[PDB]
Amino acid sequence: AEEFPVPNGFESAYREVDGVKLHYVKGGQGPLVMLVHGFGQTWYEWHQLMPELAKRFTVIAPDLPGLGQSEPPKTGYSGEQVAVYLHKLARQFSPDRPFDLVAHDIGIWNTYPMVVKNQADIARLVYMEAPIPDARIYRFPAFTAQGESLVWHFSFFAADDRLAETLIAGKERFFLEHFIKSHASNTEVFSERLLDLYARSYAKPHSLNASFEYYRALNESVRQNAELAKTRLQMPTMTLAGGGHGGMGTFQLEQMKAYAEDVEGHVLPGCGHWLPEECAAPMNRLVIDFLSRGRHH
Template structure:
């Protein structure tokens, strides 16, 4: 097959454009800040309109890498490891979602961020809601991704509480049982909370998170997040008395939270868009990346 010079030039231009676009996705930087009495590790990338991404249990800021790549073209993206998780510090407590939100807010303040859009998944959505409830004038949009809000509506009937045992699985005996078996414990979440365990977290990510949580003190910190649910429920019930008016996007997995979280969200915010991701379970970023990332990018514009 013969190619004219102009056609070859055109192909070259297209290849160059594709490579340039790929290079434009800035690799996130690793940073550490001492805020609110705790060391917080966070990823940062891009510049412009700030977006804060808050991870959930069994994961860390690492979960957001695909979204960071998409958002950093137009936004300053900040993705912290919550206290007790990833590379952040391990305070004795408290691990209420309100205090964890105060950590994130203190980090934002230290970076000169006066207003941000906030996204949270799993435990992170509870922290995101607590952030917006405590600082409503400093949040322009909020996205909640598959879990539930303790203390809001009929919250004890939520799908994720079908395995109630692990929300009370803390203390010396549970810690002894999971020591050296962290992955076995996490496989329950990664496999059973997915619509299809073969489309859940990758093998590389499973190894990465197991290594992070196997660090001394990290499993205990994770368990303290569950121990705090009773206090979270009291605080969230009080927050809900003053509904938010912030634009809120709620993304849930059809095989996970479904309509439940959307119904809860409408009890705490008057401006809610709810989307159930078909054929997906709890791990939306991993199970439905191609649908979830564009939806978040569009909402956060």
């Protein structure tokens, strides 16, 4: 069974990595690029970019552990633990050559440690729409002069006693529509049909729980990254962020400058958090062009 429609000419399959069955969608030929989704979504956020990249690359888009059709992690949900699964998965498909990495939202949290620990394995890097977990996250406001803060959910999801699962169970579809639209500028792209697809996936009880465990592990990830960040990234890096409602604006590039020696950043006007769907044309173009500076076919 498939939760989301696979693009024509791609395959949906699984690889067991360290005892965990990871779902991925793969297509194309050439050097490998791995696309890693974030919270509220699955590999499917990349389904418009995938066919375009597959003209020049082998493209793989996994479901994060516990989300989509991937089994929960057996170790834990901190960035360093999850990154092991992702690094090993990618290296199964590209054992002898570096691969490219594109990550959105908590995809960043779940890949940063494997990038810094295996720099030679990463040719080029694109990060969009989430802070790397570090002390900067403790400075985000709980409440703003415009109202509902964009990261209040960090505390909601991290709260003990399964506060978030308990309140959200049975109302997953309602909650996700609010969360997604509240973080968007171009809300019109989030049709009821599309929201139904994403909600059905994260409503699986293990997936709802997994979602929140990433936040319960956030402070551990921050502690992990305080050590890891002693070495700056050396590979070409690009950041993207939305400049509209819900977007991170200038924060993305500014933080990345502290992490990377070679970084270019873009803020996309009139686009919020959900770049691949809110602003498919300019986002896809930026990603394709950036990755095409390296060898492809």
